[PDB]
Amino acid sequence: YVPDDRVLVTETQVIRETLWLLSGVKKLFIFQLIDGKVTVRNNIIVTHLTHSCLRSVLEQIAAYGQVVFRLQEFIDEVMGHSSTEAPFRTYQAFMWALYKYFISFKEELAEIEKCIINNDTTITLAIVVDKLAPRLSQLKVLHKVFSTGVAEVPPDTRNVVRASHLLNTLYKAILEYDNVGEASEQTVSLLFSLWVETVRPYLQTVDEWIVHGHLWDGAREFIIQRNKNVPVNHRDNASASSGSDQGPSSRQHTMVSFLKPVLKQIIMAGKSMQLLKNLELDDVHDPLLAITFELTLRSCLYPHIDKQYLDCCG
Amino acid sequence: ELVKDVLNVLIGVVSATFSLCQPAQAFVVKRGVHVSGASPESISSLLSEVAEYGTCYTRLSHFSLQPVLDSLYSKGLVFQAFTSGLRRYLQYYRACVLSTPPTLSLLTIGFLFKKLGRQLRYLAELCGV
Amino acid sequence: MIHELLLALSGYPGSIFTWNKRSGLQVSQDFPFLHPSETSVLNRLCRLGTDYIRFTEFIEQYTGGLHGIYLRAFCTGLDSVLQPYRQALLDLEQEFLGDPHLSISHVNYFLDQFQLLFPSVMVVVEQIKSQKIHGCQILETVYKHSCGGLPPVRSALEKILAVCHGVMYKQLSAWM
Amino acid sequence: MIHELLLALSGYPGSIFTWNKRSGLQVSQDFPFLHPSETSVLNRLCRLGTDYIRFTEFIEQYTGHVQQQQGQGGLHGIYLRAFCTGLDSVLQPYRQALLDLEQEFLGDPHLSISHVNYFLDQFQLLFPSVMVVVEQIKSQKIHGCQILETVYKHSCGGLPPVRSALEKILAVCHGVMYKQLSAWM
């Protein structure tokens, strides 16, 4: 038999490699990446490991490696690192929340590293792998929200279709994990944090229109597209402050699910306020929120809106 | 440890220098080249920026320091008033330099004086000297 | 060897303990290094790892076929029964790291208590797959094996059943 | 490698961190002593630095450079000066943070680069954003008050930190406008 040459890396070196990989880093000697696919390096051997078993565990870490990498590639793309005046305004709110999650994850990985470098405490592959198990639980769910919300249609041509859909893979999958159990309360608290920092843009636009009386959006992000609002007020439906005739529809256009219950009230307070003129909604939801009760949590958001319609339209 | 010198380099001191001489040929700033005791070049570059501030102090302290002499025909009574006021500022500037904690981090000392460093260079340019 | 097995019992199979669909982690080789018969001891030990590899494939797909909020609750449970079987494979290595003489037998003795919880929690899982107990009749197949009688598998199945009762106390609290 | 990086980020280059006007800061990319894994991280860290140097150069270039001597809004103007006065004060926390890291390194003699990545990673996002606010000003030769709007359109930013960050600058610039309006009226 011919023996094949192998590097003989130490088991201690492997732990430093994975912790850097689990955080965003490229060009690691182990887990060599080739085409957006992180793959275990072909030849690495350790004194107390057979080549096959080491390949099995390493490939297994590398798979989590592929998820964190894809999220790092998206975050990178819309961080400003890269049209003329096209702030998408929702992908920016989602990536920012994703970044906050990536900061805290990178810090737990920093603590594990500090103990690994300056102590006699034994940290080996099995100890750390099982130490991170709650973080690895979170990543598989996070990959799923992304692989449907942003990867469902790969060409992804339309812009209103992309924003309505993302707010609808977040309002939908939170209900899915709502009654899963009360054991960890980890996955739901994570998904809910992504949800509040992805609707923050839509609820800035709604509040601006409900009292300032001007619907104001770019990239056609909002669902009541005022496509016919440019020339209608010359007429004095004809009052298409909200040309929902070209805005919400069952097939040609789309409506986000969470706002269907209050949709009719918003448009009519919106038109009412603009006629009244020709003569803190994110910061109100969060205060009431701070005091399986998922639909009921969204129930406490509505009275803030019912008050505006009842008063302004009156 | 070396920073102690830099602190007083804000005031005129000789550990570093502004030789009134031909740039480089005799004009000079104390520096360490090739072999040095814990001195990567950027430290010298950072030391050079403070120095710029210092050169101004010396020249400025000089421009205002020269008193009237009781026979300033070239300048007017009003020029003699300007200098007097300038010194009052220079004295306040000198007091802040002295107030600096004797104990402070090397990089921290520059970041602390940056606002003043430009403020004075501007004051310097305001006068031709 | 004592790190190849103390990971082979865990999910990573490796070269010694080859994995196969018809039978799992069945090492089949004549090795000068292990004693001729340690393979007989290992074969008995291999039975435990095969079910741990399989139990995680099942929790993976959940959490046309089986679907529901209960398979998202029996499965969270199969994670907690398996938790004292993860911490008890970490400690084996820690003792093994310093003591250079402890042999395979110490693995046998330390991991003999997991040959009563694991074989009888595997029939509950095959029952839930061979028969599509997808709706609320999943609670029946836990409380029908929970009366039990082998005491280690009698409180294990109790851990799984109570979790179901917490999902069944939240749907029935919103209604009433 | 440790004190050296703080020196570079602080805005003064060294041989290991070679300043090229085209390449901003750049590692030599070849040191047998350091394996490739740490290199990328440094490059990433360098980006924050690449921006720090450019900003200071620009601020230095148009601020206090002359005693008001074809000056025009792109070239100069009370407003252009106001943008600079603000740019440095908004960047102030970055200075405090870098200063603080040293205190910890003085406190402990062996802290990983990853530790650096974690503390400075909030700035990793604010700095690229502020860059476009200036980049638009230079290319369009934005003149006078038209600068006041250019920031305001980026005041709708989807990062809450950036929004607060830019808002500070408009408050500073308005001061002058409020100042000139303080007279004609």
* Alpha helices, DSSP H, located in A1-117: 11-22, 51-77, 91-117
- Residues recorded for chain C: 176
Cβ of C80 under 8 Å from any chain A Cβ? yes
Residues 6+ apart with CB under 8 A from A81: D128
Cβ of B52 under 8 Å from any chain D Cβ? no
- Decide: B128 and D126 in contact? Cβ < 8 Å: no
Say which residue the tokens 């038209």 belong to.
Answer: D146
Cβ of B45 under 8 Å from any chain D Cβ? yes
Phi-psi category of A183—alpha, beta or left, where left has phi over 0 and alpha has psi -120 to 50?
A: alpha
Closest CA to D84 of D160, D146, D154, D172: D172
In this structure, which amino acid lies at residue C32?
Answer: P
Six token digits for residue A218: 């770019």
Distance CA B69, CA B91 (A): 20
Rg of chain C, C-alpha, whole Å? 19
Cβ of D129 under 8 Å from any chain A Cβ? yes
Task: Show residues of chain C in contact with A180, CB under 8 Å.
Answer: 63, 69, 72-73, 76, 167
Six token digits for residue B17: 């220098």
Distance CA B103, CA B1 (A): 9
Distance CA A166, CA A94 (A): 9
Closest CA to A256 of A144, A172, A156, A194: A172
Phi first, then psi: give them for residue A46, nearest 5 degrees. -125, 160
Task: Show residues of chain A in contact with C93, CB under 8 Å.
Answer: 124, 126
Say which residue the tokens 């094996």 belong to.
Answer: C145
Q: Which uninterrupted H or E stretch holds D17?
A: strand D17-20
Cα–Cα separations (whole angstroms), residue A186 to A133, A294, C160: 12, 15, 19
Six token digits for residue C88: 């008890």
| Entry resolution (Å) | 4.1
In this structure, which amino acid lies at residue C86?
Answer: R
Distance CA D25, CA D13 (A): 8
| Side-chain-side CA neighbours of residue D151 (13 Å) | 25
- CB contacts under 8 A, D 97-136 vs B, are 98-99, 102-103, 106
Six token digits for residue A81: 């690192």
Distance CA B67, CA B75 (A): 11
Method underlying the structure: cryo-EM
- CB contacts under 8 A, C 4-33 vs A, are 4, 6-8, 10-16
Cβ of A80 under 8 Å from any chain D Cβ? yes
Residues 6+ apart with CB under 8 A from B124: B56, B59, B60
- Decide: D176 and D82 in contact? Cβ < 8 Å: yes
Six token digits for residue A246: 């070209």
Say which residue the tokens 């002058």 belong to.
Answer: D176
Six token digits for residue C95: 């003792």
Phi first, then psi: give them for residue C80, nearest 5 degrees. -75, -40
Cβ of C88 under 8 Å from any chain A Cβ? no
- Flag if D118 and A29 touch (Cβ within 8 Å): no
Phi first, then psi: give them for residue D26, nearest 5 degrees. -150, 135
Say which residue the tokens 């009244």 belong to.
Answer: A276
For residue C87, the SS3 value is helix
Phi first, then psi: give them for residue D15, nearest 5 degrees. -60, -40
Six token digits for residue A102: 């990536």
Helices B41-65, B3-10: inter-axial angle, 10-degree rounding: 30
For residue A33, the cross-strand partners are A38
Distance CA C60, CA C82 (A): 14
**What DSSP designation does A38 have?**
B
Q: Classify residue B106 as exposed, middle or buried by CB count within 10 Å of its CB (0-12, 13-18, 19+).
A: middle
Distance CA D157, CA A201 (A): 10
Say which residue the tokens 């409506």 belong to.
Answer: A255
- Smallest Cβ distance to B126: which of D7, D67, D98? D67
Cα–Cα separations (whole angstroms), residue A86 to A72, B8, B74, C62: 22, 54, 64, 40
Phi first, then psi: give them for residue B75, nearest 5 degrees. -90, 165
What is the least distance, in Å, from the CA of B105 to any CA of chain D?
8
**What DSSP designation does C45 have?**
H
Rg of chain B, C-alpha, whole Å? 17
- Decide: D159 and D129 in contact? Cβ < 8 Å: yes
Q: Taking every pair of C-alpha atoms in chain B, what is the biggest distance, in angstroms?
A: 54
Q: Count CB-CB contacts under 10 A for residue C24.
A: 18
Distance CA A244, CA A253 (A): 10
Q: Count CB-CB contacts under 10 A for residue B65.
A: 12
Task: Show residues of chain B in contact with D59, CB under 8 Å.
Answer: none
- Decide: B34 and B40 in contact? Cβ < 8 Å: no
Distance CA A212, CA A273 (A): 7
Closest CA to C121 of C88, C154, C149, C143: C154
